[PDB]
Amino acid sequence: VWKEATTTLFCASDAKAYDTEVHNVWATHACVPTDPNPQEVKLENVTENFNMWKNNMVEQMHEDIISLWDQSLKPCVKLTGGSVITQACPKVSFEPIPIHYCAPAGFAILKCNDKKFNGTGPCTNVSTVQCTHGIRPVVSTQLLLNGSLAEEEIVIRSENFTNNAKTIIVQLNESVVINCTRPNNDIRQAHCNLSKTQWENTLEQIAIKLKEQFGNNKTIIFNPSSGGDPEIVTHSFNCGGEFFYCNSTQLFTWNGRNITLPCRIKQIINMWQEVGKAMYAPPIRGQIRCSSNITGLLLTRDGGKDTNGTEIFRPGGGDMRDNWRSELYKYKVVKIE
Amino acid sequence: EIVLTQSPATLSLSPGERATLSCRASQGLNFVVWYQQKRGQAPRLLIHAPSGRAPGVPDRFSARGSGTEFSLVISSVEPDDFAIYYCQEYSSTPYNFGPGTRVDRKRTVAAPSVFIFPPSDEQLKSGTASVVCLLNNFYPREAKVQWKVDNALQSGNSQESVTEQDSKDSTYSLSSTLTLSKADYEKHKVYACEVTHQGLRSPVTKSFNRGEC
Amino acid sequence: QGQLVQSGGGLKKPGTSVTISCLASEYTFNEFVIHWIRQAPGQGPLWLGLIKRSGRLMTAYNFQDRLSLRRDRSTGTVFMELRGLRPDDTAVYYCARDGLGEVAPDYRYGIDVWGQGSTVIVTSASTKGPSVFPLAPSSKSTSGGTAALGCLVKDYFPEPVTVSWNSGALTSGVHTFPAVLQSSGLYSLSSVVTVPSSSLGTQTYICNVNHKPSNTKVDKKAEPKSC
Ligand SMILES: *[C@@H]1O[C@H](CO)[C@@H](O)[C@H](O)[C@H]1NC(C)=O
Ligand SMILES: *[C@@H]1O[C@H](CO)[C@@H](O)[C@H](O)[C@H]1NC(C)=O
Ligand SMILES: *[C@@H]1O[C@H](CO)[C@@H](O)[C@H](O)[C@H]1NC(C)=O
Ligand SMILES: *[C@@H]1O[C@H](CO)[C@@H](O)[C@H](O)[C@H]1NC(C)=O
Ligand SMILES: *[C@@H]1O[C@H](CO)[C@@H](O)[C@H](O)[C@H]1NC(C)=O
Ligand SMILES: *[C@@H]1O[C@H](CO)[C@@H](O)[C@H](O)[C@H]1NC(C)=O
Ligand code: NA
């Protein structure tokens, strides 16, 4: 029988106890070892409802990453509640590891294996598992990095597409590698490189999926963000403990085989996890370099007025629940009783 | 975006009676929310989206509907419930509010006592002239005033003001002020306001002639 | 809980800009959408824009060239800037929160908490005391004693004016109408009373007007015109 149930999950990971890297440290304390051979059972002749936008699993992960960041990081200056505290702020090793979320006894995780599952509604190819796949808690706007990819063609999802207020989550099937670098020896000047040819073709195939959703006669266009905090206006992410803010105008203007985005490292940032402000030490001299798989996007549609035949889409993000959602959309917890 | 319309404009009721307010949508909706508003206060949420009533809201309030038609039901009206009620839609921005449905206290129909006031000689010095038409203690609230200057219908150059429903006799009062220049007032003789109202089976006209006190 | 405290507003001249702030609880600021909504006199609420918890800004198409929203994550405050002010921008401006179906575990829509409101008045009018004219009693109108008389309190700014009769010793049958904004930019109202016609010859009637913003106070005796 079972039924949708909220319960405290526990986590599993391949974290290393000798590693002082803060994700490894957190997981070492909070998680258990992963199963070598994880079992997966198919449920023949079974239909089950899913709702990625109303999934308690997302909330539990949200809580973990907030505490992870709140525990791990050490800004030189922090403002919270009109109060200012200052502390030692050494640089730290920062690199997310995959985390698995598992159901306790008396509960179980259902997994939707249906082709082209749009995020809500019937799933006919359902299976049960002990734990989710390994999920890297990547904090980022406006692209989803190091995530999972659909084997088939691109898939776009929304709680409701005719609702302009609701975010659109794009799941790619072919990833686009992006290398960000702060040149060795302005210490805040950085830049990201990715394939032009690969990004244009990506944008095109996204527009095709958007056309399926809004109509063939609709002409699709991509514009930069309408405004907001620096974090959501730019493509913001972490790389080697440093906080990057990359100008993504070249990624989201659409109607040189490499695309170079001008980036800036910022010491003074807004905290995504709480009200206030944090200040970190300036970046290390030497080499700061990362290489991430662009695996998804967060988009927002203008709407705003009577349809002009044209639909404008802009990069989104800001609510990290959507980041977790892009990985947990296929899972739901049930009380197996 | 959508367009919302509410009916009726006014709902007259005695305490204890069942109220049902209507909300109509131009296109299909999933839901609507309802707000109560009293004078001087901000809107107060009554019914949350699917579904139920906001905190502090009593049981007698209920709502339901889907697509084009929605309704707010008050099983047994209490004196605290006499107010203006709006519906609101969430299909997309901009989020539209309804024009509102006024719930007032029912009473036996009462015709207005109509009075007309010429402009004082004091004001006439100032180069302007104000002509006032008073509708005193009437019910229902809906009433039409029509100004005429020498049988010329005055339109757009008058302003109306209505008191809150009297808490004791459940009636309304209304003033209509016609604004004329002195030169125009000096140029015409007969000034009249004609009142149409349910308590009157033929419209009542009150008038005066300039220079004939 | 669960509070929204606004600040800003007041008298503005046409063409200028106005900024209204809205301090929210950390919980609200973190979890809820916050709308900006105004309401003009005699009108219903009008949605101007919102700020999602993600930070996304959305404005009404009819205001997008004049309206700017932003938030300060340092204190948990949101702002609206309305530029190129016009007389019809005169309204009470509200900030108000809404889960917008995104707050777990209920996922409800509905604007459940409203700020106290910020009054914005756009005009070129300066402070001015009213002129008080009499609305003289009738020759003999309504049967019995009842005859109607009053005061016309015209051309004043800003609101409010208060009106009493006979030093407040006359409340029976008094109607003081809410003010109207004239095309001139100045306010005006009337206060009337119904009284016996038998008393019109003897009883003295004085409406007491008070416009505090200009320290103007008037006592006007209304009596039958000399005919
Ligand atoms: C997703 O697909 C299901 C099944 O066809 C449908 O009921 C639901 O409305 C869809 N939701 C979308 C397209 O957002
Ligand atoms: C990825 O999806 C696109 C359509 O979005 C399709 O054209 C392409 O062949 C797919 N490639 C792979 C490897 O699945
Ligand atoms: C990114 O770096 C990898 C090696 O780590 C390289 O193979 C790839 O070509 C680089 N891509 C870009 C766009 O620079
Ligand atoms: C990005 O760069 C363009 C110029 O290439 C500039 O016009 C724009 O303002 C920049 N945006 C941000 C968010 O830095
Ligand atoms: C993505 O993974 C690569 C390799 O593990 C890592 O170097 C990079 O920092 C990751 N990106 C983010 C945004 O964490
Ligand atoms: C989205 O909302 C519209 C009404 O605004 C409704 O007609 C449509 O069925 C909804 N689609 C969903 C919930 O997938
Ligand atoms: Na006196």
Entry keywords:
heterotrimer, A: about 325 residues, alpha+beta, HIV Envelope Protein Gp120, Chain G, 23 strands, about 15% helix, B: mainly beta, Immunoglobulin-like, 2 domains, six-stranded mixed beta sheet, four-stranded antiparallel beta sheet, 17 strands, binds sodium ion, viral protein/immune system, HIV-1 attachment protein, Broadly neutralizing antibody 8ANC131, VIRAL PROTEIN-IMMUNE SYSTEM complex, trimeric
Q: How many domains make up the coordinates of chain B?
A: 2
CATH level-two architecture of the largest domain in chain B: Sandwich
Helix share, percent of chain A:
10-25%
Major interchain interface with per-chain residue totals = B-C, 46 and 53 residues
Number of strands of chain A: 23
The top-level CATH class of chain A is: Mainly Beta
Please estimate the helix content of chain B.
Answer: under 10%
For the sheet with most strands of chain A, the description reads: 10 strands, mixed
The dominant shape of chain A is globular
Largest sheet entry of chain B: 6 strands, mixed
Assembly type of the chains comes to heterotrimer
Query: Structural class given helices, strands, pairing of chain B?
Result: mainly beta
Percent strand of chain A equals 25-35%
Number of helices of chain B: 2
> Please, how many domains of chain A?
1
Pattern of helices and strands of chain B = EEEEEEEEEEHEEEEEHEE
Spatial strand sequence of the major β-sheet of chain B: 2-9-8-4-5-6
PDB class: viral protein/immune system
Keywords: HIV-1 attachment protein, Broadly neutralizing antibody 8ANC131, VIRAL PROTEIN-IMMUNE SYSTEM complex
Assembly: trimeric
Entry title: Crystal structure of VH1-46 germline-derived CD4-binding site-directed antibody 8ANC131 in complex with HIV-1 clade B YU2 gp120
In short:
Chain A is 17% helix and 35% strand.
Task: Explain how this protein is built.
The PDB classes it as viral protein/immune system. Keywords: HIV-1 attachment protein, Broadly neutralizing antibody 8ANC131, VIRAL PROTEIN-IMMUNE SYSTEM complex. The complex is a heterotrimer of chains A (337), B (213) and C (227). Helices cover 17% and strands 35% of the residues of chain A. Chain A has 337 residues and is an alpha+beta fold. In chain A, strands 11, 12, 13, 14, 15, 16, 17, 18, 21 and 22 form a ten-stranded mixed β-sheet that branches. In chain A, helix 2 (56-72) crosses helix 5. Chain A is globular, with a radius of gyration of 21 Å. Chain B folds into two domains: 1-107, Immunoglobulins (Immunoglobulin-like, Sandwich); 108-210, Sandwich (Immunoglobulin-like), CATH 2.60.40. Helices cover 4% and strands 51% of the residues of chain B. Chain B is built from two helices and 17 strands. In chain B, the strands form four sheets. Chain B has a six-stranded mixed β-sheet with strand order 2-9-8-4-5-6, with no helix packed on it. In chain B, a hairpin with a 7-residue loop joins strand 16 and strand 17. In chain C, 3% of the residues lie in helices and 45% in strands. Chain C is mainly beta and 227 residues long. In chain C, a hairpin with a 4-residue loop joins strand 7 (67-72) and strand 8. The chains are: A alpha+beta (337), B mainly beta (213), C mainly beta (227). The interface between B and C is large, with 46 and 53 residues. Bound molecules: 2-acetamido-2-deoxy-beta-D-glucopyranose (6 copies) and sodium ion (NA). One 2-acetamido-2-deoxy-beta-D-glucopyranose (NAG) sits between chains B (28-30, 91) and A (160, 162-163).
